[PDB]
Amino acid sequence: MKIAVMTDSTSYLSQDLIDKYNIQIAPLSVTFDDGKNFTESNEIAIEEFYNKMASSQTIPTTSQPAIGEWITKYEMLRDQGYTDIIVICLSSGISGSYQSSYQAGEMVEGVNVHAFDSKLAAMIEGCYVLRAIEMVEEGYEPQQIIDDLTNMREHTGAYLIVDDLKNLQKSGRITGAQAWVGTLLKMKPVLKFEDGKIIPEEKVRTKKRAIQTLEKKVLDIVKDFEEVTLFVINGDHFEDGQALYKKLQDDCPSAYQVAYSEFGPVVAAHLGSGGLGLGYVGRKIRLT
Ligand SMILES: CC[C@H](C)CCCCCCCCCCC(=O)O
């Protein structure tokens, strides 16, 4: 037995963790209306991506990893000697990445593939990667890891805000809230993940009250969990995510693990400018 853990690029893991654990990545891509194509990786300057999205007359579109890109990664790992591959994917409710990883896993010869639907994105998806690696080190077998991740998913979630619903409506990634699209006025939507999809939670009078609402919703849930990891998951407005991060560090006990992260180009194309999420896991995830 020799177990590998891999993921798609939307887990937005740091290059430090990718290098240290040799994590293979099946990348998603963005295509701009000028025909320029970019594959996700930590060498892309995220500020450069936001600049091009702001200068685009048409919103950029995204692409999941092709099934052949999953296959090539599975073949490379097999040929390094791995017998089993745990694959952590972007939510199946918002992308076909998971289903293509699953079908690729049925198709590749000579290695066992265990594809897992995180039902989330960004570093909350990334926490499933880090939990699986930790379990591999402790000697667990693949089905035990999958059972542990399925339990973890019962106490994991995220709420988020956006400036405008126009990018999510364009791509079809907001479920419901059709009466909010275009209106809103000065009001800001608070959204949440629910069984893998993005749905309305509440509409509040200002952005400041929307960020206060993110904190309240999440703290009301995680107070019942025996362990807690929170991630601020920030977009292009550095100060909004930084201020929420510092506030959580103050309001929460040190028994909560509180971290800061940013999402990359693919998620940014769907949220638009001003996206900001607060995600949670009822586990103490190893972040080093
Ligand atoms: C704050 C960040 C939160 C946690 C994640 C928001 C995700 C928005 C929808 C992303 C859809 C990506 C589709 C990729 C594809 O298959 O073309």
Token digits for 218?
A: 């999440």
Residues with CB under 6 A from ligand 1: 28, 62-64, 94-97, 121-122, 158, 160, 173, 233, 263, 266-267, 270-271, 275, 277, 279
Concatenate the DSSP letters of all residues of the chain into one string: --EEEEEEGGG---HHHHHHHT--EE--EEE-TTS-EEE--TTS-HHHHHHHHHT-SS--EEEPPPHHHHHHHHHHHHHTT-SEEEEEE--TTT-SHHHHHHHHHHH-TTSEEEEEE-SS-HHHHHHHHHHHHHHHHTT--HHHHHHHHHHHHTTEEEEEE-S-SHHHHHHT---S-TTTSS--TT-EEEEEEETTEEEEEEEESSHHHHHHHHHHHHHHHHTT-SS-EEEEEE-S-HHHHHHHHHHHHHHS-TTSEEEEEE--HHHHHHH-TT-EEEEEESS-----
Token digits for 112?
A: 């066992």
Pairing of β 37-39 and β 29-31: antiparallel
Distance 34 CA to ligand 1 centre (A): 22
* Residue whose CB lies within 8 A of the most ligand 1 atoms, among 38, 94, 260, for a mutation test: 94
**123, 12 in Cβ contact below 8 A?**
yes
Location of structure tokens 């300057």: 45
How many residues are given for the chain? 288
* Fold entry, domain 1-153: Rossmann fold (3.40.50)
* Structural determination approach: X-ray
**Burial group, residue 54, by CB count within 10 angstroms (0-12, 13-18, 19+):** exposed
Pairing of β 61-63 and β 84-89: unpaired
**164, 170 in Cβ contact below 8 A?**
no
Distance 94 CA to ligand 1 centre (A): 6
Helix axes 238-251, 207-222, angle to 10 degrees: 40
| Resolution of the experimental model, in Å, one decimal | 1.6
Domain boundaries of the chain, sorted by first residue: 1-153, 154-288
The dihedral formed by the CA atoms of 246, 247, 253 and 256, expressed in degrees to the nearest 10 = -60
Token digits for 75?
A: 């073949």
Token digits for 79?
A: 């040929």
Distance 198 CA to ligand 1 centre (A): 9
Pairwise CA distance, residues 87 & 132, whole Å: 9
Pairwise CA distance, residues 215 & 247, whole Å: 9
**71, 6 in Cβ contact below 8 A?**
no
